[PDB]
Design a protein around this nucleic acid. Structure first.
Lengths: 156, 106, 48, 111, 127, 197, 183
RNA sequence: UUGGCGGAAAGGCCUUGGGUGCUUGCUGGCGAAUUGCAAUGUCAUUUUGCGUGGGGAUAAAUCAUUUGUAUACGACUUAGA
RNA sequence: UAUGAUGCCCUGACGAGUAGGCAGGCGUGGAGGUCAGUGACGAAGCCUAGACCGUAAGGUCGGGUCGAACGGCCUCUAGU
RNA sequence: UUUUAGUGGGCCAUUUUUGGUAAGCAGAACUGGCGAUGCGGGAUGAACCGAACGUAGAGUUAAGGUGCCGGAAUACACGCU
């Protein structure tokens, strides 16, 4: 016995956690995000793509659409904190965004239902975007800073 | 576009120091184009990444990144105290450094 | 006063040809051959 | 020392935030009412508002209630001191001395 | 596996070398206190080597534990391994340095039966 | 916000320029100072001449060589005045002093590029009018800078070679100004004047 | 019969030792560094000329207060010298190692000295007699020499490991997003 | 490609004339998702080496020898098909 | 029942230090008991910008060298 | 209440103070330090200013500062030189 066995042994029993007092409570959004807002994406593959905001999903994320006919952005989730909200808006009424949920995006080419829902949304949104001048060119444009851009001076 | 930049560029200055002791756990960032502390209250929490190259390729890249964030203001001329996950190597005094816009508050 | 150019003459004698070698006997004596080729024309490089 | 006349507000904020009781010495927080009750119900005091009332209206039992509190472990002041040098008198533009009503301001930066 | 333990915090990881153990060969590296009067290590000037003292001591839950969350425990023979049958996921067996090659395989085969982690299973192996 | 900043030296106080130049080097901006010989020091000529002759008696006794070296040219007077600010013994200081190039006059690689000034260093914003100042060219020529006449000759070159340039710029902008005259009153000019441009 | 640190194939290596040689240590080391890493035939033609004072062994480490000379210009060093006795006790070992190569059947045209070292032997104590009735030591510094020569060989081609890469899902999400552009 | 200008560290600047590529000056069509809620998401510059391809040229210095205008020793200065 | 009461747990205050005092431990040679301990299928020692534990004295392991004895623990002892 | 170690060479400073032309001299008084003590400040400096130290994190401060060295206003206001 090259080490003398100890008398007291610590228990191998795990213990139950205390009844924690943290209720789940929903996100109080900042007021610059209203359905219809043209947004700017700061991260992901679609960085700097000007995009069209849609229904606030219930995993505290933001379902957005491109529309994909313009810039190349699908229906997608984007978190709220990674997004610069521009001031300019579009009308969103008439678009049945309220089908989708968290279950819709499921990690496992494209499942064809996604492209079908893309066309169904984007035809109404293109019919909305044609109503305002120069906006269809604007959403296709990427966003980046120039020299002498001071993003505290800049407004959105 | 010819310009693809989504980050406000900035310089690195010395560490947090007195005359004769320096604290490596806090770095100082000089953001271009900021004057007051009130004009630097916008950059609070915006996440800083130092982007530097290397020689050996690891994980499919030669470019390595040290992440961190702005914690608070510093001085009257808009200098900024910023900490990192692992601190900047003190060779990079007067190196460029990136201050992203995410986490956006706007 | 920085020197901008130098121009050497055409047929250097064997003494200034000997100044440029530490070892005149072994050498091919080839100093100022390719420079003396600049007189094959009218000297337009030399007049330049 | 720097001393002065505390009003109701600074006394209230101190007794709520930094107010600690002396119970066999044992500096014990004043989070609960019945701590104050079980120590000072002999003296009529049975809440923390009874403490603040026996402080600012110096009552029959100021000694025991004031002795029930631990000394207030205050912070450094929030906005600096207002002087370059502390150790001149307050009348000479320093810090120490009777600064009566201004002590309110200073304790609210040290709370 | 191990018990849920907090993340192991190791206040000062660096080995406390004796002052001037680098400068002289006759000075060992082992920590011995400089007790002189003109000292700067006892006198604790800045920029000089940190001395061990009781604040450096580690947490009572995570004391003696490896990264694997287990108190290492030397085991010589099989019959003394069998006192870890009840308490497996707290201690970890470690075979002593002088157990020969015909008994290390015996201890490992018994430990694999009773399910005890061995910190050095590769000791004295013939490939 | 440029890669290289070229600072005009004419009408700049040695110390007040040298301090901000030595601050920007230690933040990583390549600075090249041109025309350093028309730089200015406050106080009159004889004051600064005596300040220089105090510095010009301080060599090491046992060997005059390895002492303080007394550089005469105004580029190197400003260089001396600047490396007294940059902590120049550590590696960071040697790296910072490599970011600085200081010239007498305006050299060929730098006269086609636009030259800036430093407003917290210009002697015409700083000195109270009526004090004396000191032209650094006069000072250096007095203490052994053999070259000022030669420098002046070259400036008497390049101003001429620049003056024609300015004419060959200025008339052109006139034409552009004329086009900017005829681009008014259109719809696009009205829409830009609505949007602030 | 052990040797120094040799990284070479013993199957093409012939060696000679010669321990306990009474030479200077600080001259045998330096002739062993003048010889080191050359072809054996260039060394054997070289150490013949050192006795002729034609070319000189360059003293590099044990070199203080040596009279400088011209011939060390070959090797870049001003302090060179002609240690003849170390050269005889080295070139004896070179012809011994060449004979060991010829007995091993190694082709002598490609031999090069791949490992030579000398180090210190037990010293030979005598004594000398100083002023005011003193005795101080007077010792030789004899030398264990050893050398290993080896045939040089090419085909040393440097194919290396596989180096499996572990790039992330959103990194291969870009790498696969560029075969869909061109390739 | 045309010509002129620039030596303070010219090595740059302007210009004649075609040719080719783009054009968001304006109006159209199609693609761009799956990097799956972000992770620099690698697109700059420098130095070297190995290869193929093409043009171009085909020497020196050092030791050893010798000299004495040099010389402690190196160095120096000489000479030698 | 199932474990240490010279334990486990709660609360609070505090923590510089030469000469010096006290306490708690680490290490070395030998003695008694004990682990029916380890060991030529290789002890002890030695080398090791290899690993783990303790705040630290120190412990433990892996590798190489090696060739015969040696270690943990409860106690005694000193030419420690 | 017992018992026992180590000291029995001291120095500095503000005010009080003796001798002395004085002194980084000699000698006293009350107090605080240094010896025995780290830290931030006085560029440095046993005793001066602050402030006394278990190991870490964050916040606020002291004394001292904010042209550059060096963290921090080439800030503001009135004058003088």
């Amino acid at each position: 016995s090259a080490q003398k066995a100890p008398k007291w042994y610590p228990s191998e029993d795990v213990a139950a956690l205390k009844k924690t007092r943290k209720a789940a409570r929903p996100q109080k959004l900042r007021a610059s995000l209203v359905p219809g807002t043209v947004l700017i994406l700061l991260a992901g593959r679609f960085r700097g793509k000007r995009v069209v905001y849609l229904k606030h999903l219930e995993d505290n994320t933001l379902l957005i659409s491109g529309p994909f006919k313009v810039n190349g952005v699908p229906l997608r989730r984007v978190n709220a904190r990674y997004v610069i909200a521009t001031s300019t808006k579009v009308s969103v009424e008439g678009v049945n965004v309220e089908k989708f949920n968290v279950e819709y995006f499921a990690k496992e080419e494209i499942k064809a239902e996604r492209v079908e829902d893309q066309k169904v949304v984007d035809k109404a949104l293109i019919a909305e975007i044609k109503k305002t001048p120069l906006l269809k060119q604007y959403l296709s444009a990427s966003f980046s800073l120039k020299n002498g851009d001071k993003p505290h001076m800049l407004k959105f | 576009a010819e310009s693809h930049r989504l980050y406000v560029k900035g310089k690195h200055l010395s560490y947090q120091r007195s005359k004769r002791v320096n604290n490596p756990n806090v770095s100082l960032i000089k953001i271009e184009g900021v004057a007051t502390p009130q004009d630097a209250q916008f950059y609070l929490g915006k996440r800083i990444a130092y982007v530097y190259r290397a020689s050996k390729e690891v994980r499919g890249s030669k470019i390595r990144v040290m992440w961190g964030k702005v914690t608070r203001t510093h001085g009257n001329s808009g200098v900024v105290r910023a900490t990192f996950r692992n601190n900047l190597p003190a060779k990079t005094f007067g190196a460029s450094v990136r201050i992203f816009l995410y986490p956006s508050n706007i | 006063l920085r020197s901008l150019t130098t121009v050497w003459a055409e047929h250097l004698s064997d003494e200034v040809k000997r100044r440029f070698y530490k070892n005149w006997y072994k050498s091919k004596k080839k100093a100022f051959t390719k420079y003396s080729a600049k007189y094959a024309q009218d000297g337009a490089g030399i007049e330049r | 020392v720097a001393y002065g006349y505390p009003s109701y507000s600074t006394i209230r904020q101190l007794v709520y935030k930094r107010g600690f009781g002396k119970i066999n010495k044992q500096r014990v927080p004043l989070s609960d009412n019945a701590i104050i009750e079980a120590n000072l119900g002999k003296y009529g005091i049975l809440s923390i508002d009874d403490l603040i009332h026996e402080i600012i209206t110096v009552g029959p039992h100021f000694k025991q209630a004031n002795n029930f509190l631990w000394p207030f472990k205050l912070s450094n002041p929030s906005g600096g001191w207002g002087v370059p040098r502390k150790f001149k008198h307050f009348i000479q533009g320093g810090s120490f001395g009777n600064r009566e009503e201004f002590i309110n301001k200073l304790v609210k930066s040290m709370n | 596996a191990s018990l849920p333990h907090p993340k192991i915090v190791k206040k000062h990881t660096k080995k406390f070398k004796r002052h001037h153990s680098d400068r002289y060969h006759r000075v060992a590296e082992n920590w011995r206190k400089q007790k002189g009067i003109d000292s700067v290590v006892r006198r604790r000037f800045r920029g000089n080597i940190s001395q061990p003292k009781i604040g450096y001591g580690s947490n009572k839950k995570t004391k003696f534990l490896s990264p694997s969350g287990h108190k290492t425990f030397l085991v010589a023979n099989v019959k003394d391994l069998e006192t870890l049958t009840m308490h497996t996921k707290t201690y970890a067996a470690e075979i002593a340095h002088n157990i020969s090659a015909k008994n290390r395989v015996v201890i490992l085969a018994r430990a694999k039966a009773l399910g005890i982690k061995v910190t050095n299973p590769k000791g004295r192996l013939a490939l | 916000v440029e890669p290289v900043v070229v600072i005009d030296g004419k009408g700049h106080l040695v110390g007040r320029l040298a301090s901000v130049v030595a601050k920007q080097l230690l933040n990583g901006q390549k600075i090249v100072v041109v025309r350093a010989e028309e730089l200015n020091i406050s106080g009159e000529f004889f004051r600064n001449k005596l300040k220089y002759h105090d510095f010009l008696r301080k060599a090491t006794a046992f060997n005059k060589t390895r002492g303080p070296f007394h550089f005469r040219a105004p580029s190197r007077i400003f260089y001396k005045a600047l490396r007294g600010m940059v902590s120049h013994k550590t590696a960071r200081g040697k790296a910072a002093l490599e970011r600085l190039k200081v010239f007498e006059g305006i050299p060929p690689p730098y006269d086609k590029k636009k030259r800036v000034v430093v407003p917290q260093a210009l002697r015409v914003l700083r000195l109270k009018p009526g004090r004396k100042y000191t032209t650094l060219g006069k000072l250096s020529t007095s203490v052994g800078w053999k070259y000022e006449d030669v420098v002046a000759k070259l400036e008497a070159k390049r101003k001429v070679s620049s003056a024609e340039y300015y004419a060959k710029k200025r008339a052109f902008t006139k034409k552009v100004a004329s086009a900017n005259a005829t681009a008014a009153e259109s719809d696009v000019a009205k829409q830009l004047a609505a949007l602030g441009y | 019969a052990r040797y120094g640190a040799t990284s070479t194939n013993p199957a093409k290596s012939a060696s000679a030792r010669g321990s306990y040689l009474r030479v200077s240590f600080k001259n045998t080391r330096e002739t062993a560094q003048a010889i080191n890493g050359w072809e054996l035939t260039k060394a054997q033609k070289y150490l013949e000329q050192v006795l002729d004072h034609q070319r000189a062994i360059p003293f590099r480490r044990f070199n203080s207060s040596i009279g400088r000379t011209a011939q060390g210009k070959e090797f870049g060093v001003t302090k060179a010298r002609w240690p003849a006795k170390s050269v005889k006790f080295v070139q004896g070992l070179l012809q011994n190692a060449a004979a060991n190569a010829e007995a091993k059947g190694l082709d002598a045209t490609k031999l090069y000295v791949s490992h030579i070292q000398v180090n210190q032997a037990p010293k030979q104590r005598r004594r000398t007699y100083r002023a005011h009735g003193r005795i101080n030591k007077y010792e030789s510094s004899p030398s264990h020499i050893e050398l290993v020569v080896t045939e040089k060989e090419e085909a040393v081609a440097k194919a290396a490991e596989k180096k499996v890469v572990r790039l992330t899902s959103r990194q291969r999400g870009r790498i696969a997003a560029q075969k869909r552009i061109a390739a």
